[PDB]
Structures are given as C-alpha cells and as structure tokens.
Ligand binder design. Sequence first.
Ligand SMILES: Nc1nc2c(ncn2[C@H]2C[C@H](O)[C@@H](COP(=O)(O)OP(=O)(O)OP(=O)(O)O)O2)c(=O)[nH]1
Ligand SMILES: [Ca+2]
Ligand SMILES: [Ca+2]
Ligand SMILES: [Ca+2]
Length: 341
Amino acid sequence: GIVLFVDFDYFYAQVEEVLNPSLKGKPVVVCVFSGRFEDSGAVATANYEARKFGVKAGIPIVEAKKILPNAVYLPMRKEVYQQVSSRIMNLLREYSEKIEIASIDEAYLDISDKVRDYREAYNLGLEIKNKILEKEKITVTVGISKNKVFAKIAADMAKPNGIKVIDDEEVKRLIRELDIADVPGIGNITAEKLKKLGINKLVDTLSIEFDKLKGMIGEAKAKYLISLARDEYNEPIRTRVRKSIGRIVTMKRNSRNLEEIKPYLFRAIEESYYKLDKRIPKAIHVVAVTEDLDIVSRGRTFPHGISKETAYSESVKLLQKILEEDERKIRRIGVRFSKFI
DNA sequence: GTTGGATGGTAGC
DNA sequence: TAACGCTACCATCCAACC
Ligand SMILES: Nc1nc2c(ncn2[C@H]2C[C@H](O)[C@@H](COP(=O)(O)OP(=O)(O)OP(=O)(O)O)O2)c(=O)[nH]1
Ligand SMILES: [Ca+2]
Ligand SMILES: [Ca+2]
Ligand SMILES: [Ca+2]
C-alpha cells in the first residue's frame, strides 16, 4: 500500500492571504468574535508570522491583541474556506478516486494503483503541490508512507510547505525510536498512562502483557498500538461518511432563562438542519457549554427520522432537562444530529 | 447471555 | 488573562431483550 496524506498549511489564514495578497509576509490572525464584549472570542488560526509570537488556535482575541496589537485581525469566513477546500479536494480526486477527506483541510489518497514505488510517490506529491499552487495559490504539506498513520507522521515532520517519505526501513526505525506521544491518537492522558507502564516507544508495547496494557489504556488503543508496533496496521482508505453534524453558538451573556436561550438554540438548529443536506438523522443531542466551560449534553434517539419540526420540539425538552438536572448557567448552546438513515 | 442508547472523555488517531 | 468552532471513536453504566 502507498498512502499520500495532504494537509493545507495555516489554512484559513492562508485563504485570506490569497484573497488579499498585501497581507502576505506579516501577521494575520483569523478570529471568531463572540459579541459578549469588545474583542471577546477566540483565534481560529494564525499564520506562521503570528505563531512566532504565541498567537495560535484557541487563545483569546484579547490575549492575541496584547501580544500583536499591529496584526491583521479578520473574522472567520468558514463558508469561503469550505469552498476553497472543496475545490482542492476535487483536484485531489483527479490523482486518485480512493480519497478519504479527514477534515476541512486534509485528505488521504490511496495511490497504490497510480504509482509503483516511493520515488514515483514523491514525484506525484510534488505534482500535487504544484497543481494546488497553480489553481488555488495554496501551499500544502504532503506525507507519504505505507499506511495512514505513518503518512500522517510524515506530514507532521515536514510541515510547513513540506513533502516527506517514510519508507519501510524508516517505519521500522520509528517503531523503535519515535517518542510514543508523537503517535497519532496519543495525547497527554494516554502518554502519561503509558509512562507509568514504562512504554516510551511503540516497540515497548511488544514486551508488556496484553491485559496490563488493556487495563490501563483500554482494548481499542492497545490493539491499535500493538498493530503499529508489529508493522501490521492496515486500515484501508475509505470515502468519508459523516456520522454527526452540529452547530454550537455563543450567547451574548450567560443564562438559565429558557426564553432567553431558545433563540440561540433555534439558530443552531436552523444552521445544523441546513448542513444536513438530504441526510435524515434519527438522533438529536442538545449540547450546552456551562459558565465554567464544562460541556454537558442531553439527547434522544428515535425509531424514525427527525423532521425540522420535531428537532425544535425535542431540543426544547432536552434544554429543559439540562436546566432541571444542572444548576449552572449556560454560556454556549447548540445541537448535534446523528444516526443518519 | 448480548445489544445499543445516554452521557462524557480523549484526541484530533 | 479568557477560553470559538467542529467531529470520530471509545468507555462506562444502565435498561431492554434473549
Ligand atoms: N474555529 C477554529 N478552527 C480551528 C481550530 N483549529 C483548527 N481550526 C480550523 C482552522 C485551521 O486553519 C483548519 C485546519 O486545521 P489545522 O489543525 O490543520 O491547522 P492549520 O492548517 O491552521 O495550521 P497548519 O500549518 O496545519 O499547522 O481548521 C480551532 O481551535 N478553532
Ligand atoms: Ca493544516
Ligand atoms: Ca489539518
Ligand atoms: Ca501527542
């Protein structure tokens, strides 16, 4: 198998640089302004010039402005970015129809039938990079390896504006040498737990009793790590099938008054239901972010599909359930649809 | 004995 | 100092179904 993974560089900020070339080469910070007070909200993403000064995805806009007051601050235009993305995913389909879109800015291509070895895979990667540059003026990072996980690791090593092959021999090397926290699917919590068992590299999973690994990080993560360690991880590339679609919005001010929260909930529903595009969901969850930023939800699965009308009725009840069973004020409110027919 | 819904945790797999 | 937005997959706990 040969997998080619593509991830667009500083995507939203880069799209804004393409739409306004005079922004290029100086700090650009793409923001979601929440309206709670002047400059309330969070950074969605920043370009690399901005990142050098600590302005990155997830920090507050007021914190960013304290560091880079002279940066260019642009509101998030997600619809514009989705259009560029979709045009790029369609360019990627011309190189292989076996495509797994994994996010708004990344995809895995199985090119096993389009190229014969890694040398040709590398040349195709450069071809892909050059094409997206010609058509969309977007730079990307390409990772190439024998499976999805290592193609991902290869891109991570190579970003930004990179291309990198991890061949069979280097996979064997990384199984021994790569820090296990840098393996996709291993964050802070799982890494810490693995340290307590003395597992720092993938290779170390081959030494521990299966039930002890399973007991600490669970069956699925244990199977996954051992499979990578054996070099027998072989998840095929498959067409993305979206499993849930949702929208959460932020309120001008925290509240537990149902009548004040309803307008927001209902906008979340309108936007979410529009995003369904023909899909008919059987489950609905109302999702609230409380005043202390804890996430709570209540949901319901129906034996049949949920109409817009039923979504309205049922979401109000689920919001009432949250209010009755949780003391806290609500900061953000939204909805998630799943279990599509 | 399973199956799967409700809720939440982990990691962007 | 304040913290927006989006989603797949898994774990635990529990009721329903044999
Ligand atoms: N609103 C919001 N959007 C985010 C957040 N994180 C990522 N995104 C969106 C904006 C990014 O441009 C886009 C792609 O995510 P990536 O993780 O690949 O980061 P990005 O491409 O911006 O930087 P890149 O060079 O990979 O490092 O997804 C976030 O915390 N909030
Ligand atoms: Ca990216
Ligand atoms: Ca990405
Ligand atoms: Ca990690």
